[model samples]
Target: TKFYTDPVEAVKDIPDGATVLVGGFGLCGIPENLIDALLKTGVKGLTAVSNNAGVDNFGLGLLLRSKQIKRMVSSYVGENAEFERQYLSGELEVELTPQGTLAERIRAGGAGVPAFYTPTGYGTLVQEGGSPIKYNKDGSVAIASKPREVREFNGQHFILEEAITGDFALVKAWKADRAGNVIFRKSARNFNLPMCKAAETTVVEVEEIVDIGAFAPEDIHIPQIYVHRLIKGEKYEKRIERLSIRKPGDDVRERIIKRAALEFEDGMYANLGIGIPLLASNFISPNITVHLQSENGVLGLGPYPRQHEADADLINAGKETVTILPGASFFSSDESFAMIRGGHVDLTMLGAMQVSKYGDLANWMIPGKMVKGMGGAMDLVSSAKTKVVVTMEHSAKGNAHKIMEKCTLPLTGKQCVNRIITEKAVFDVDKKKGLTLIELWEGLTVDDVQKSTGCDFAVSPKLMPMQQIA
Candidate 1:
């Protein structure tokens, strides 16, 4: 079911008026060659689906330039000006979205789910139908998102969102094996993962194509079964809308992720909370089968594709992309949280602003700034059975203590945190003994640890010496 070809050949059969799924978050992992070939073919009246419409000149914006795209179904549409011009002039149709809902909708389409309820924008949007998707020539509303019926699920209101599919999926991946098992690098996995299955036929472009068995069984992100056609993307601009300046403290953050990943044991279903825990994903051992879970709804997160060095290796090439390990799966948000709240999650690894010596966690809220709401952090920490590990710095910037005798910030969960890992040391939140010092980071000292954290800590039973990081 898989054929290997260039983008010129791949774009031949896509008919006009086709519903096409284009994968990428902005410009990072777009199918450049395919879009170029599609442009050359001049297919008209297309409905494009993606998370972002892309910038004015790159990614899907290229399709919009020649007036080929008829409609766009996307979440973040801020970057594309042509998309805005066409929508404003009533020349294009736009379906805006809640980012997570859109993602689940694509995932749902892939799985044959017709429609599903979502708590994301129920009371706030899509029910009353005020948001317009297209404007009339006289500035009246030409089209708008349809109103939805809201239903109560466990005392919360949810609006029904229809599933979306496409005639073809134009995907970009870092590399693939001969059988078409694909891998996405870094953040490119955004929508590419779901778009692969949310279409009738999937054509993927990659940097390299390896032999069938070249990758470990653990390394294949999406199996060859989901991939229909493959190509070696001949060239890449790798452009960004803005300059990327790596911050000075990235090394510390990397160390923190490395330290947090130490707890990812074999065969554990761990809910990797957003932000830092998501970055910790790449460190999991490819030899082990730890199912990493996310709030956006996926499991079996694995290490980066083995050929990440990107030199004169065997291949040629798109998401902020990362591969899902073997046994990875896609599901809805409700089911994902249900898996956690039902105590099926063995471990919950998340960053913390503060953790009390008494095992209280205060990560979600601060006193003055507007809160991002409690969200899934509330569900993740409430379960008594899940082992909550706080992965954070020992102190906030300028030596503000993160682990304290009593947290000043509002609590996410009380007496729930079990382990705390920092760049300086590893600690255990004890039932009676309080914050216990278990292991030291390499080239770290207890004097600095005690002085920095500013808490009297109980010693661990193992009292293990430091492990060298170098």
Candidate 2:
């Protein structure tokens, strides 16, 4: 049935103090028209759940500017300075969650499951509760988080996380039919699919609204049963977060990437972390194929598009515009993590802030800085099935080494790193042998490695020169 052609009328009954599930990754796939309509209603005390709050004056930031949103449940928040201000000033409530945990929570709610356990936040402040969620008028604590229940199964620890359901789900789709069947493009499927079924009323705004039967049985991502109302979005901004054009000095980034690319094997499913690890995609061996996975729910990602060939709908987990390979397919965030957690993915290459001699990783946050929440870093590290490789510089800005005796910051995962690839050397982590130096860059001796590293490591019996990649 045609629910409402007028966007304002569609969102008129959302009411104050309602939980809203807004779909989008950065600005892509956001229900722009619906958000405009929400502003028109002047609704307040809203709890907005999304991947990231939009930058100032766009997406959810508009509502935030109007003081319409009282709470935000998100995994990342670095883009919006206003969000940071409001959160710091105690004018807003924030619930920071791990990326994979947030996705699974929504999926569990939609599936009628009450809660589930995950290992993502087991060793972090997520369970410890030192992180602030809400503050008082005087900048004191209004509400502080409590530790999640911990349970041990087999040999690993898992924390209990409750499912999340919303009063209204505001979603964006690439296409929908008159009967409300829907399909999402690329990584836009991130949270949109699960949010559709997790809300009491799922209202969709689509770019294209076709007639009934336009969607084939196999192509429908969300069946009409879950969608309660539908409106065709008048327009879309489809903005890119940042435009990266290659430059001369970026060769250093390429060097780090090429070294990490050495870990790739034929037909392996790999997840590349943001920053330096993303460059590894450019240097993948042409002879072999690897399926690249993004935690925002995409697989088989292709190359970064040239400026002239960019597509707003095509983006990676980092919100950088990317292309899709021939066999690329979009799935729900739930299924994406299942593949990672279940060990179907063979390798994960991530950037790091610090690495311990025992292979511990700490890359999520710095103590005083407000960062985008840890988006899938913890899960990627904790996954037993995925072997992790880290690519980073040997030292920080002040000449402090990242290769340390132990991590000074919060740990993402304990002893999860399998290998380390720096610009100067390559090292492998052995459970019993600690870090073993396997290779070195030209003109670098063991003394250079020792001087730059804060930790002591054993020289590999088979130590050799680092191989150059074409």
Candidate 3:
């Protein structure tokens, strides 16, 4: 049964030097009290399996200060100056995994895939000590699937990959009922659910506790069976990563930027997806800073600039760039994902091709279209704490078809989104498997929205427009 327990007491079960998986994407939906309890216990030689350790003095940042973690199994390695210093100084043991493979690893462990082959780490230093299997001209190898078509780029041939897995999991949930059943909010759903199932023990923390029947069965995001312990608390002091804003302009692109700037808030650690969302960075105010992350290892991103002022190296999770915050760090793709999967991020503002009534997001793949690349959406969706989807009210093709009941594209991450902020309205996507219309635009009504989309969505009883931030 779910019950309110102190984080320090629940965490006492963690033995010294044990391997623990902490959930969240970057600093998003982290189990703050639990981490603090772990710290108070002074457990030593911990083998932490997470995205990247939190930044210094915050999130996992505190753990770094205590030097409690002995080793880290992660994909990305950006920011976190202390983490890098410790690793470079040989004070920490680090194992890097490919970003995509790492997500599959946690997913496989939860989904019972055991071990699968993925080409994400085929060559380079990643393949060291691993056997190299040869494939026939058709790119066919025994356990390795053959390449259907071969194209040479810079005299090299590349192929697809398989899957991966992990052990021992830790997760964070927004609300938990008496039965340990959980409901995650937006991006917070990322890797926590899978990581919980992938491990022998899944310790979860929540902001509030409710009755077993409190949430509809359809709204339950994670069942109680996967959770071993629960920590409940109130109030989290979320920090802003950077601050950005937009300039006055009449151009469509410029207006999109202006709209984003007008909606930006403080105390939010935000990640900007490619294109429009990046403009939000331009609206940052000094008091409210927003940190930016790219799966390519950019942290504390700044506003984009014209060709004259752009930084050649700056980029977001999607690999597009503008400027970077001071003290930014860089790492390989594996290390970049380590930060994402390990739960060092806070909020991720991603774009969506389609959003389900229940908040299922389809942003990565567009069926029959082989043009877009899947960089970090899968991991970001499966890892962040607050997954915010930013999209236009209508599609550019002038088709009122972007919003739908079910997605047609291959999902980037399944049913894990928390909210959708569009030009028309702001929505709160609960775990109920349907869109609960939270708020409507000033001039729009629920019928106005429902008529344009393909989904069976209703205005949420809790509906309200986004408040203007001071």
Candidate 4:
């Protein structure tokens, strides 16, 4: 019979020194309750695989505080100070994987993709340590470029990437049935779905547990077969990574130009998420030190133009091509994701499509709308340690507002959201009951938000309690 119980008890049986796979990118849909219980169990010598570690005090960050993990197999690893100190001091053993490869590996493991190969690391340190193989093109090694392969930019070679797999996996879901059929609300669908396929034992943590047959067949993100165990919990803490913006008529032509005047503190190792959040790199002041993280793998932040000039191959949080910042460190997607998963990323600022009053997030793909696939939103938001989301009050039409009772679109991360900064107002996810309105944008009220949303909003002592800056 399938065991049923709270998250703490479910994970309590995991025992010490087990290689486990965790779902969520940064902290989205993270098994918050399971992690809490595991930390208390005094389990040590863990080998964790993920996008990044949690923040200094919360999320997986506290795991680092407990110092239970003996080693980490991750992609991003430059955000958390304790993680960096441990790595630098040789307190922990670390193995890095490319973001794409890591995600694909997990996916393949789940989908039964045993081993595939790609040309993502034709010549850099990413491939230096590993076994090297040659190929003509078309992603087929040791063969001539196929007719389907077109030589882009003159003569660069491309190849196939081998699939990756794992032993066991642990993940989070928005909702689940007793049978373990999982449903991800939106952006939280990232690695959780794909990683579920890769492992032998998949443990799932869910916010809402519906009665059987309640969720429609089409709504299920992960089938019941993929998840072996279920953990139920109340309340979620959705966190964002970073915050940045630019006023209208800034004349900022490039992505980096938009946030030309933003100020950052010293020694802040931060990754710029897609769109507006990515603009933070261009505007950062010199005195306030910062490090840039890309899903394609680059640590040590640099200025935009200079970074582009130095290497035109860098990618940003969105997994799109971008210029690097100054004095930046260059690593592969493997090392980049290591920084993110290793609990090193200090802050991650990301954009969003819609966010609920309770702080559930959906930023990447809009269901029914032709959606672009996710690059690192899952890993970043779920594992970044510190997640800060930035968005406007309403959708492009302005007729609809983002603040809602629950998310209707696809999910990026579940209730893991920490702080939401919008033009209308700012709010924090309630630790227990629901959402707390921390700040209201000028000329906006909770009633206005409710009227615009047309949904039931759980208001608390924090709502409209004080005036706020837009």
Ranking by lDDT: 2, 1, 3, 4
TM-score for all predictions? 0.57, 0.94, 0.50, 0.50
Model 1 C-alpha lDDT versus the unseen true structure:
0.73
User: What is the Cα-based lDDT of residue 63 in candidate 3?
Assistant: 84
lDDT of 2 by residue, 183-242 (tens): 998778878888998999999988888888888889999999998989888778777776
What RMSD value applies to candidate 2?
2.1
Q: Write the per-residue lDDT of candidate 4 for residues 326-439, one digit (tens) a residue.
A: 565543334455567555777777677777666667765453332233445655654525655553434446576566777766565556566655544455665356665565
Q: Candidate 3: lDDT over CA atoms?
A: 0.60
Backbone clashes, candidate 3:
63
Model 3 poorest ten-residue lDDT run? 127-136
Error of 4 at 347 (Å): 26
CA-lDDT, candidates in order: 0.73, 0.85, 0.60, 0.57
| Candidate 1 lDDT, 150-232, residue by residue in tens | 89877656578789889999998888988789887655565777888889889899988788888898877778888988889
Error of 4 at 330 (Å): 29
Which segments of model 4 are wrong by more than 4 Å? 1-3, 130-167, 243-277, 280-470
Name the candidate, 1 or 4, with the larger lDDT value.
1
RMSD of 1: 10.2
Specify the poorest-scoring 10-residue window by lDDT in model 2.
243-252
TM value for model 3: 0.50
